[PDB]
RNA sequence: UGGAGUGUGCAAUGGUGUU
RNA sequence: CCAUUACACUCCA
């Protein structure tokens, strides 16, 4: 129960499309790579000066240890060589000096056989060695980590003015991926926020938005102090780099330091012969304790400093304006970047005998045919998705709900969301819903104004107690408010009442589209069915009872608190499959693995038996969030749990489980070779594009699928990896099943980027966050919904 | 908080020689 | 050990 099934076959269904994946062919030898561990004298050091130290070391020990040989360096504690150093395997101490004295230690750790990697790529070995991948990646990263500024898995460089005292930098993501019979170099383009190489005296003017310096409070000092504290600066009156720790209250004119107290102005006047044209401005507290103060005039901001401070609205907007590119642009500039590749003249790449193809990889894709969408009414219209999108016009819900009793709680200020607004909104909404097959019969039996979160619970309690058969409460909100979270908390977990929140700006002005989507959400929330997949147009999987599960875990920031990770698992409740039930669990901080999964799956199965009056003969389980290195872990526990949930349900019940992982967190971009295939303004690949060759895993069952229409930028094709399969799916059947499951998402009239169960799981998970706001098992009750909410699709 | 899509945040950066 | 760490575009009936 810990070995993923091999690729059963390749796919044939769909229309052929000629693509180009941003992968580049790598030719690697079968040599043994020698791995050494390093340790520098200052255990805490910037990863750049570590590289400088290492290269200085390699250069200054050419007659004793190194020579023609060039070792690649991880940046932390790992060094790699193509051939064994004349060191043996015992620790060796070497002194290195820099324009300071460093003492490094090198010791052999292991050997990295590329032959094993070759066997893995050929299928001789079922599993791929990780150390090989890591080593190769280090080799590829060495030089660009020296010539450029490494951030995560990307590299950045300068020459873009933003204007927030910061600049925008462009760069490229680079990783190494195993393929069939070969390794691939994955290059993609990216950008990030940096600090502009400025003189501090102008950085002040940018931060406070003074036009220049000629325009001469305490708050002005504080706001600058926040932005500058923690950054590095360089001396211009000699070179030497420091780190800003604070900003003065005493200007250089009236600041003193040791003993005879000399003023910074007078000190720079006597010692540094500087006029100091700005004697009145604050002084940069540098180092610590001991006074080391330097005025703004002599200080410049060092280049290459990344920003972490959350971006201003204008920063984000401007950056998107300066990053927004259609697929052909990204493609062309990636090609442009690999025109400058020249990996065959990079001495470190040459060292390990590696070659890289300077042209993008040609992969062949198949555009799957979209499923037919069935609607209800007496029209019984059948919608056909064109380019991943169909329409909600001249069509009625498959199963429309009659809203007989509903209320309106407006938490927006009465002045901004007036009565005429509410009345008109009601009229239009009732029209749209009437045409949608979800007739809102009468006027709202209740429509009042409220304010603050504290009014939520007493109000809803009044609504539920007073009005018989209350189905829905429409909640008008004045933008971002704690009122939303309170409304969801009370409505979903406390009282069990259906809820639709609406922004006031969407009430002030009517839009048939917005009202339509609103009606979708309302209909679903009230227990209705918007549409179903055409039963005739479905894979044979549905010939037997089958349940579809989705699962997702979200985590709090890594730095703090007992803040728990929350796991959500949803499951289909019909053989369409349209209706889903949700289960939530609070679990240990930062653990990407579902522990209570057995109980949750048990609950979902029990609900399935209560609904269909059948037992699922198959279990199609989509899970999102799990990365590669976690597979063996996840697949070990969760799978068992599922089986546990099957064996503890009844005595000999063991349905065929299909464990599939979904990820968008990758840089695999697919482009059109034929410009006539480019869809839309962004020129992305058509919805339904499937790739299962060339750039995929050499042994195991996985495939790329882009099931959505790309509106802006470059599409992110979802990657699917099959970790288990008792049902023994063929490639085509599973790809098609996934594609059609992408069409069962109720919140819109589109095919989304991932299957509906995973998406729902994400929604429920995100909802739990709102449920938690204002000891483990205490408010683990906070994420549990009401008895009248359990079986509902409350999660929008 | 009508919705989808894609951009940037995921813990990494940093303790340094005179003033 | 200590210091710092969700918004925004583009679209739609």
PDB file of C-alpha atoms in Angstrom, chain A residues 319-573:
ATOM      1  CA  UNK A 319       3.281  45.526 -10.875  1.00  0.00           C
ATOM      2  CA  UNK A 320       0.444  43.598 -12.505  1.00  0.00           C
ATOM      3  CA  UNK A 321       0.416  46.270 -15.213  1.00  0.00           C
ATOM      4  CA  UNK A 322       4.143  45.559 -15.585  1.00  0.00           C
ATOM      5  CA  UNK A 323       3.849  41.767 -15.513  1.00  0.00           C
ATOM      6  CA  UNK A 324       0.570  41.103 -17.349  1.00  0.00           C
ATOM      7  CA  UNK A 325       1.571  39.189 -20.499  1.00  0.00           C
ATOM      8  CA  UNK A 326      -0.262  37.008 -22.940  1.00  0.00           C
ATOM      9  CA  UNK A 327       0.927  33.421 -23.483  1.00  0.00           C
ATOM     10  CA  UNK A 328       2.768  34.264 -26.727  1.00  0.00           C
ATOM     11  CA  UNK A 329       4.763  36.972 -24.909  1.00  0.00           C
ATOM     12  CA  UNK A 330       5.821  34.628 -22.106  1.00  0.00           C
ATOM     13  CA  UNK A 331       6.680  31.946 -24.666  1.00  0.00           C
ATOM     14  CA  UNK A 332       8.720  34.319 -26.818  1.00  0.00           C
ATOM     15  CA  UNK A 333      10.665  35.773 -23.891  1.00  0.00           C
ATOM     16  CA  UNK A 334      11.396  32.317 -22.470  1.00  0.00           C
ATOM     17  CA  UNK A 335      12.789  31.422 -25.895  1.00  0.00           C
ATOM     18  CA  UNK A 336      14.657  34.732 -25.788  1.00  0.00           C
ATOM     19  CA  UNK A 337      16.101  33.756 -22.417  1.00  0.00           C
ATOM     20  CA  UNK A 338      17.278  30.375 -23.683  1.00  0.00           C
ATOM     21  CA  UNK A 339      18.889  32.179 -26.600  1.00  0.00           C
ATOM     22  CA  UNK A 340      21.142  33.553 -23.869  1.00  0.00           C
ATOM     23  CA  UNK A 341      21.346  30.141 -22.215  1.00  0.00           C
ATOM     24  CA  UNK A 342      24.734  29.017 -23.502  1.00  0.00           C
ATOM     25  CA  UNK A 343      24.906  26.203 -20.944  1.00  0.00           C
ATOM     26  CA  UNK A 344      27.539  24.646 -23.179  1.00  0.00           C
ATOM     27  CA  UNK A 345      29.981  27.456 -22.384  1.00  0.00           C
ATOM     28  CA  UNK A 346      29.161  27.546 -18.666  1.00  0.00           C
ATOM     29  CA  UNK A 347      32.300  26.006 -17.084  1.00  0.00           C
ATOM     30  CA  UNK A 348      30.353  24.501 -14.176  1.00  0.00           C
ATOM     31  CA  UNK A 349      27.843  22.817 -16.482  1.00  0.00           C
ATOM     32  CA  UNK A 350      30.745  21.694 -18.684  1.00  0.00           C
ATOM     33  CA  UNK A 351      32.449  20.332 -15.570  1.00  0.00           C
ATOM     34  CA  UNK A 352      29.784  17.663 -15.079  1.00  0.00           C
ATOM     35  CA  UNK A 353      29.516  16.938 -18.804  1.00  0.00           C
ATOM     36  CA  UNK A 354      26.015  18.314 -19.296  1.00  0.00           C
ATOM     37  CA  UNK A 355      24.373  19.750 -22.411  1.00  0.00           C
ATOM     38  CA  UNK A 356      21.081  21.636 -22.675  1.00  0.00           C
ATOM     39  CA  UNK A 357      18.937  22.084 -25.786  1.00  0.00           C
ATOM     40  CA  UNK A 358      18.516  25.780 -26.602  1.00  0.00           C
ATOM     41  CA  UNK A 359      14.987  25.242 -27.929  1.00  0.00           C
ATOM     42  CA  UNK A 360      11.619  24.532 -26.313  1.00  0.00           C
ATOM     43  CA  UNK A 361      10.298  20.958 -26.176  1.00  0.00           C
ATOM     44  CA  UNK A 362       7.659  19.942 -28.731  1.00  0.00           C
ATOM     45  CA  UNK A 363       4.923  17.954 -26.990  1.00  0.00           C
ATOM     46  CA  UNK A 364       1.700  16.717 -28.594  1.00  0.00           C
ATOM     47  CA  UNK A 365      -1.573  17.354 -26.804  1.00  0.00           C
ATOM     48  CA  UNK A 366      -5.142  16.170 -27.216  1.00  0.00           C
ATOM     49  CA  UNK A 367      -8.105  18.503 -26.791  1.00  0.00           C
ATOM     50  CA  UNK A 368     -10.765  16.464 -25.003  1.00  0.00           C
ATOM     51  CA  UNK A 369     -14.360  16.917 -26.124  1.00  0.00           C
ATOM     52  CA  UNK A 370     -16.425  18.692 -23.436  1.00  0.00           C
ATOM     53  CA  UNK A 371     -19.488  16.988 -21.900  1.00  0.00           C
ATOM     54  CA  UNK A 372     -23.097  18.019 -22.550  1.00  0.00           C
ATOM     55  CA  UNK A 373     -24.853  20.010 -19.831  1.00  0.00           C
ATOM     56  CA  UNK A 374     -28.462  19.054 -19.080  1.00  0.00           C
ATOM     57  CA  UNK A 375     -30.992  21.583 -17.779  1.00  0.00           C
ATOM     58  CA  UNK A 376     -34.582  21.331 -16.562  1.00  0.00           C
ATOM     59  CA  UNK A 377     -37.922  23.089 -16.882  1.00  0.00           C
ATOM     60  CA  UNK A 378     -40.180  22.068 -19.750  1.00  0.00           C
ATOM     61  CA  UNK A 379     -37.670  23.403 -22.260  1.00  0.00           C
ATOM     62  CA  UNK A 380     -35.140  20.740 -21.228  1.00  0.00           C
ATOM     63  CA  UNK A 381     -32.359  22.588 -23.050  1.00  0.00           C
ATOM     64  CA  UNK A 382     -28.961  20.959 -23.557  1.00  0.00           C
ATOM     65  CA  UNK A 383     -26.085  23.421 -23.231  1.00  0.00           C
ATOM     66  CA  UNK A 384     -22.837  22.775 -25.091  1.00  0.00           C
ATOM     67  CA  UNK A 385     -19.625  24.272 -23.650  1.00  0.00           C
ATOM     68  CA  UNK A 386     -17.752  26.227 -26.308  1.00  0.00           C
ATOM     69  CA  UNK A 387     -14.169  27.131 -25.401  1.00  0.00           C
ATOM     70  CA  UNK A 388     -14.792  25.996 -21.826  1.00  0.00           C
ATOM     71  CA  UNK A 389     -17.770  28.325 -21.443  1.00  0.00           C
ATOM     72  CA  UNK A 390     -21.531  28.004 -21.888  1.00  0.00           C
ATOM     73  CA  UNK A 391     -24.530  30.176 -21.065  1.00  0.00           C
ATOM     74  CA  UNK A 392     -27.367  30.528 -18.543  1.00  0.00           C
ATOM     75  CA  UNK A 393     -29.875  31.964 -21.026  1.00  0.00           C
ATOM     76  CA  UNK A 394     -33.095  30.340 -22.273  1.00  0.00           C
ATOM     77  CA  UNK A 395     -32.339  27.585 -19.763  1.00  0.00           C
ATOM     78  CA  UNK A 396     -33.950  26.650 -16.454  1.00  0.00           C
ATOM     79  CA  UNK A 397     -32.468  24.783 -13.477  1.00  0.00           C
ATOM     80  CA  UNK A 398     -32.554  20.982 -13.517  1.00  0.00           C
ATOM     81  CA  UNK A 399     -34.233  21.162 -10.114  1.00  0.00           C
ATOM     82  CA  UNK A 400     -35.361  24.674  -9.212  1.00  0.00           C
ATOM     83  CA  UNK A 401     -36.270  25.766  -5.692  1.00  0.00           C
ATOM     84  CA  UNK A 402     -39.367  27.805  -4.832  1.00  0.00           C
ATOM     85  CA  UNK A 403     -38.452  30.642  -2.476  1.00  0.00           C
ATOM     86  CA  UNK A 404     -41.678  31.260  -0.558  1.00  0.00           C
ATOM     87  CA  UNK A 405     -40.221  32.832   2.587  1.00  0.00           C
ATOM     88  CA  UNK A 406     -37.036  34.918   2.697  1.00  0.00           C
ATOM     89  CA  UNK A 407     -35.601  37.964   4.479  1.00  0.00           C
ATOM     90  CA  UNK A 408     -33.228  40.890   3.914  1.00  0.00           C
ATOM     91  CA  UNK A 409     -30.756  42.106   6.525  1.00  0.00           C
ATOM     92  CA  UNK A 410     -28.920  45.173   5.252  1.00  0.00           C
ATOM     93  CA  UNK A 411     -25.752  45.810   7.264  1.00  0.00           C
ATOM     94  CA  UNK A 412     -24.805  48.579   4.852  1.00  0.00           C
ATOM     95  CA  UNK A 413     -25.475  52.206   5.869  1.00  0.00           C
ATOM     96  CA  UNK A 414     -29.072  53.134   4.999  1.00  0.00           C
ATOM     97  CA  UNK A 415     -27.877  56.306   3.260  1.00  0.00           C
ATOM     98  CA  UNK A 416     -25.763  54.379   0.752  1.00  0.00           C
ATOM     99  CA  UNK A 417     -28.078  51.397   0.254  1.00  0.00           C
ATOM    100  CA  UNK A 418     -31.488  53.073   0.134  1.00  0.00           C
ATOM    101  CA  UNK A 419     -35.005  51.647  -0.101  1.00  0.00           C
ATOM    102  CA  UNK A 420     -35.358  52.311  -3.828  1.00  0.00           C
ATOM    103  CA  UNK A 421     -32.115  50.384  -4.332  1.00  0.00           C
ATOM    104  CA  UNK A 422     -33.459  47.429  -2.353  1.00  0.00           C
ATOM    105  CA  UNK A 423     -36.811  47.517  -4.146  1.00  0.00           C
ATOM    106  CA  UNK A 424     -35.310  47.661  -7.641  1.00  0.00           C
ATOM    107  CA  UNK A 425     -32.775  44.980  -6.701  1.00  0.00           C
ATOM    108  CA  UNK A 426     -35.646  42.799  -5.496  1.00  0.00           C
ATOM    109  CA  UNK A 427     -37.595  43.314  -8.732  1.00  0.00           C
ATOM    110  CA  UNK A 428     -34.645  42.486 -10.981  1.00  0.00           C
ATOM    111  CA  UNK A 429     -33.547  39.537  -8.838  1.00  0.00           C
ATOM    112  CA  UNK A 430     -37.067  38.115  -8.939  1.00  0.00           C
ATOM    113  CA  UNK A 431     -37.092  38.511 -12.727  1.00  0.00           C
ATOM    114  CA  UNK A 432     -33.751  36.747 -13.221  1.00  0.00           C
ATOM    115  CA  UNK A 433     -34.678  33.990 -10.775  1.00  0.00           C
ATOM    116  CA  UNK A 434     -38.086  33.607 -12.420  1.00  0.00           C
ATOM    117  CA  UNK A 435     -36.434  33.026 -15.792  1.00  0.00           C
ATOM    118  CA  UNK A 436     -33.855  30.769 -14.136  1.00  0.00           C
ATOM    119  CA  UNK A 437     -36.517  28.345 -12.918  1.00  0.00           C
ATOM    120  CA  UNK A 438     -36.052  29.410  -9.305  1.00  0.00           C
ATOM    121  CA  UNK A 439     -39.206  31.495  -8.762  1.00  0.00           C
ATOM    122  CA  UNK A 440     -39.014  33.992  -5.917  1.00  0.00           C
ATOM    123  CA  UNK A 441     -42.759  34.176  -5.332  1.00  0.00           C
ATOM    124  CA  UNK A 442     -43.480  37.016  -2.920  1.00  0.00           C
ATOM    125  CA  UNK A 443     -41.815  40.094  -1.462  1.00  0.00           C
ATOM    126  CA  UNK A 444     -39.381  39.606   1.426  1.00  0.00           C
ATOM    127  CA  UNK A 445     -41.421  39.075   4.602  1.00  0.00           C
ATOM    128  CA  UNK A 446     -38.709  41.011   6.429  1.00  0.00           C
ATOM    129  CA  UNK A 447     -36.312  43.758   5.334  1.00  0.00           C
ATOM    130  CA  UNK A 448     -34.453  45.778   7.970  1.00  0.00           C
ATOM    131  CA  UNK A 449     -31.212  47.702   8.496  1.00  0.00           C
ATOM    132  CA  UNK A 450     -28.535  46.696  10.996  1.00  0.00           C
ATOM    133  CA  UNK A 451     -24.987  47.593  12.022  1.00  0.00           C
ATOM    134  CA  UNK A 452     -21.975  45.799  13.497  1.00  0.00           C
ATOM    135  CA  UNK A 453     -21.340  42.098  14.054  1.00  0.00           C
ATOM    136  CA  UNK A 454     -22.955  42.079  17.499  1.00  0.00           C
ATOM    137  CA  UNK A 455     -26.351  42.546  15.854  1.00  0.00           C
ATOM    138  CA  UNK A 456     -26.000  39.420  13.708  1.00  0.00           C
ATOM    139  CA  UNK A 457     -26.857  36.649  16.178  1.00  0.00           C
ATOM    140  CA  UNK A 458     -29.776  38.348  17.963  1.00  0.00           C
ATOM    141  CA  UNK A 459     -31.235  39.240  14.558  1.00  0.00           C
ATOM    142  CA  UNK A 460     -31.034  35.787  12.970  1.00  0.00           C
ATOM    143  CA  UNK A 461     -32.430  34.203  16.142  1.00  0.00           C
ATOM    144  CA  UNK A 462     -35.393  36.549  15.781  1.00  0.00           C
ATOM    145  CA  UNK A 463     -35.798  35.634  12.116  1.00  0.00           C
ATOM    146  CA  UNK A 464     -35.702  31.873  12.653  1.00  0.00           C
ATOM    147  CA  UNK A 465     -38.207  32.063  15.520  1.00  0.00           C
ATOM    148  CA  UNK A 466     -40.707  34.462  13.952  1.00  0.00           C
ATOM    149  CA  UNK A 467     -41.156  33.481  10.311  1.00  0.00           C
ATOM    150  CA  UNK A 468     -42.363  29.961   9.524  1.00  0.00           C
ATOM    151  CA  UNK A 469     -40.581  28.230   6.659  1.00  0.00           C
ATOM    152  CA  UNK A 470     -37.771  30.777   6.416  1.00  0.00           C
ATOM    153  CA  UNK A 471     -35.574  29.517   3.592  1.00  0.00           C
ATOM    154  CA  UNK A 472     -33.031  32.253   2.911  1.00  0.00           C
ATOM    155  CA  UNK A 473     -31.620  35.469   4.347  1.00  0.00           C
ATOM    156  CA  UNK A 474     -30.048  37.906   1.885  1.00  0.00           C
ATOM    157  CA  UNK A 475     -27.320  39.920   3.598  1.00  0.00           C
ATOM    158  CA  UNK A 476     -26.207  43.230   2.097  1.00  0.00           C
ATOM    159  CA  UNK A 477     -22.672  44.153   3.162  1.00  0.00           C
ATOM    160  CA  UNK A 478     -20.712  47.443   2.889  1.00  0.00           C
ATOM    161  CA  UNK A 479     -17.493  45.828   1.669  1.00  0.00           C
ATOM    162  CA  UNK A 480     -15.043  44.042   3.956  1.00  0.00           C
ATOM    163  CA  UNK A 481     -16.498  43.555   7.444  1.00  0.00           C
ATOM    164  CA  UNK A 482     -16.271  41.182  10.432  1.00  0.00           C
ATOM    165  CA  UNK A 483     -20.025  41.077   9.869  1.00  0.00           C
ATOM    166  CA  UNK A 484     -19.443  38.563   7.068  1.00  0.00           C
ATOM    167  CA  UNK A 485     -17.563  36.133   9.301  1.00  0.00           C
ATOM    168  CA  UNK A 486     -20.138  36.577  12.066  1.00  0.00           C
ATOM    169  CA  UNK A 487     -22.988  35.963   9.623  1.00  0.00           C
ATOM    170  CA  UNK A 488     -21.355  32.774   8.369  1.00  0.00           C
ATOM    171  CA  UNK A 489     -20.515  31.638  11.909  1.00  0.00           C
ATOM    172  CA  UNK A 490     -24.028  32.191  13.276  1.00  0.00           C
ATOM    173  CA  UNK A 491     -25.805  31.084  10.110  1.00  0.00           C
ATOM    174  CA  UNK A 492     -23.825  27.914   9.441  1.00  0.00           C
ATOM    175  CA  UNK A 493     -22.728  26.648  12.857  1.00  0.00           C
ATOM    176  CA  UNK A 494     -25.117  28.212  15.372  1.00  0.00           C
ATOM    177  CA  UNK A 495     -28.596  28.369  13.830  1.00  0.00           C
ATOM    178  CA  UNK A 496     -28.361  26.474  10.541  1.00  0.00           C
ATOM    179  CA  UNK A 497     -29.797  29.079   8.188  1.00  0.00           C
ATOM    180  CA  UNK A 498     -29.146  29.556   4.472  1.00  0.00           C
ATOM    181  CA  UNK A 499     -27.318  32.794   3.711  1.00  0.00           C
ATOM    182  CA  UNK A 500     -26.428  34.869   0.661  1.00  0.00           C
ATOM    183  CA  UNK A 501     -24.205  37.885   1.237  1.00  0.00           C
ATOM    184  CA  UNK A 502     -24.154  40.629  -1.392  1.00  0.00           C
ATOM    185  CA  UNK A 503     -21.884  43.660  -1.731  1.00  0.00           C
ATOM    186  CA  UNK A 504     -23.802  46.929  -1.598  1.00  0.00           C
ATOM    187  CA  UNK A 505     -22.270  48.070  -4.892  1.00  0.00           C
ATOM    188  CA  UNK A 506     -23.961  45.077  -6.504  1.00  0.00           C
ATOM    189  CA  UNK A 507     -27.247  46.257  -5.009  1.00  0.00           C
ATOM    190  CA  UNK A 508     -26.886  49.908  -6.001  1.00  0.00           C
ATOM    191  CA  UNK A 509     -26.499  48.819  -9.618  1.00  0.00           C
ATOM    192  CA  UNK A 510     -28.197  45.843 -11.262  1.00  0.00           C
ATOM    193  CA  UNK A 511     -26.385  43.399 -13.542  1.00  0.00           C
ATOM    194  CA  UNK A 512     -28.195  40.384 -15.080  1.00  0.00           C
ATOM    195  CA  UNK A 513     -24.930  38.402 -15.037  1.00  0.00           C
ATOM    196  CA  UNK A 514     -24.273  39.068 -11.349  1.00  0.00           C
ATOM    197  CA  UNK A 515     -27.892  38.304 -10.483  1.00  0.00           C
ATOM    198  CA  UNK A 516     -27.648  35.106 -12.530  1.00  0.00           C
ATOM    199  CA  UNK A 517     -24.592  33.798 -10.669  1.00  0.00           C
ATOM    200  CA  UNK A 518     -26.306  34.895  -7.462  1.00  0.00           C
ATOM    201  CA  UNK A 519     -29.268  32.719  -8.443  1.00  0.00           C
ATOM    202  CA  UNK A 520     -26.900  29.804  -9.065  1.00  0.00           C
ATOM    203  CA  UNK A 521     -25.481  30.083  -5.549  1.00  0.00           C
ATOM    204  CA  UNK A 522     -28.929  30.587  -3.993  1.00  0.00           C
ATOM    205  CA  UNK A 523     -30.439  27.617  -5.818  1.00  0.00           C
ATOM    206  CA  UNK A 524     -27.572  25.372  -4.758  1.00  0.00           C
ATOM    207  CA  UNK A 525     -27.693  26.622  -1.153  1.00  0.00           C
ATOM    208  CA  UNK A 526     -31.405  25.816  -0.902  1.00  0.00           C
ATOM    209  CA  UNK A 527     -31.032  22.199  -2.001  1.00  0.00           C
ATOM    210  CA  UNK A 528     -31.607  22.502  -5.736  1.00  0.00           C
ATOM    211  CA  UNK A 529     -29.781  21.126  -8.760  1.00  0.00           C
ATOM    212  CA  UNK A 530     -28.576  23.638 -11.345  1.00  0.00           C
ATOM    213  CA  UNK A 531     -27.555  21.142 -14.020  1.00  0.00           C
ATOM    214  CA  UNK A 532     -26.323  17.587 -14.552  1.00  0.00           C
ATOM    215  CA  UNK A 533     -23.873  15.882 -16.895  1.00  0.00           C
ATOM    216  CA  UNK A 534     -25.717  14.191 -19.757  1.00  0.00           C
ATOM    217  CA  UNK A 535     -25.910  10.567 -18.493  1.00  0.00           C
ATOM    218  CA  UNK A 536     -25.421   9.211 -22.015  1.00  0.00           C
ATOM    219  CA  UNK A 537     -22.270  11.309 -22.301  1.00  0.00           C
ATOM    220  CA  UNK A 538     -20.384   9.852 -19.344  1.00  0.00           C
ATOM    221  CA  UNK A 539     -17.576   7.294 -18.869  1.00  0.00           C
ATOM    222  CA  UNK A 540     -18.712   3.733 -17.968  1.00  0.00           C
ATOM    223  CA  UNK A 541     -17.645   4.404 -14.358  1.00  0.00           C
ATOM    224  CA  UNK A 542     -21.225   5.472 -13.689  1.00  0.00           C
ATOM    225  CA  UNK A 543     -22.535   2.031 -14.687  1.00  0.00           C
ATOM    226  CA  UNK A 544     -22.105   1.213 -10.992  1.00  0.00           C
ATOM    227  CA  UNK A 545     -22.571   3.212  -7.752  1.00  0.00           C
ATOM    228  CA  UNK A 546     -19.586   5.542  -7.330  1.00  0.00           C
ATOM    229  CA  UNK A 547     -18.701   8.274  -4.844  1.00  0.00           C
ATOM    230  CA  UNK A 548     -16.480  11.252  -5.660  1.00  0.00           C
ATOM    231  CA  UNK A 549     -14.340  12.650  -2.861  1.00  0.00           C
ATOM    232  CA  UNK A 550     -12.390  15.890  -2.662  1.00  0.00           C
ATOM    233  CA  UNK A 551      -9.879  16.817   0.021  1.00  0.00           C
ATOM    234  CA  UNK A 552      -7.812  19.883   0.847  1.00  0.00           C
ATOM    235  CA  UNK A 553      -5.805  21.162   3.807  1.00  0.00           C
ATOM    236  CA  UNK A 554      -4.915  24.788   4.477  1.00  0.00           C
ATOM    237  CA  UNK A 555      -2.268  26.022   6.883  1.00  0.00           C
ATOM    238  CA  UNK A 556      -1.613  29.175   8.953  1.00  0.00           C
ATOM    239  CA  UNK A 557       1.657  31.147   8.641  1.00  0.00           C
ATOM    240  CA  UNK A 558       4.678  29.066   9.670  1.00  0.00           C
ATOM    241  CA  UNK A 559       6.072  31.553  12.156  1.00  0.00           C
ATOM    242  CA  UNK A 560       3.510  31.584  14.952  1.00  0.00           C
ATOM    243  CA  UNK A 561       1.045  30.169  17.449  1.00  0.00           C
ATOM    244  CA  UNK A 562      -0.980  27.047  18.180  1.00  0.00           C
ATOM    245  CA  UNK A 563      -2.871  27.991  15.015  1.00  0.00           C
ATOM    246  CA  UNK A 564      -4.073  24.630  13.668  1.00  0.00           C
ATOM    247  CA  UNK A 565      -4.207  23.443  10.075  1.00  0.00           C
ATOM    248  CA  UNK A 566      -7.719  22.753   8.830  1.00  0.00           C
ATOM    249  CA  UNK A 567      -8.706  19.842   6.618  1.00  0.00           C
ATOM    250  CA  UNK A 568     -11.850  19.657   4.503  1.00  0.00           C
ATOM    251  CA  UNK A 569     -13.252  16.581   2.778  1.00  0.00           C
ATOM    252  CA  UNK A 570     -16.300  16.645   0.508  1.00  0.00           C
ATOM    253  CA  UNK A 571     -18.189  13.805  -1.153  1.00  0.00           C
ATOM    254  CA  UNK A 572     -20.790  13.345  -3.883  1.00  0.00           C
ATOM    255  CA  UNK A 573     -24.309  12.401  -2.784  1.00  0.00           C
TER     256      UNK A 573
END
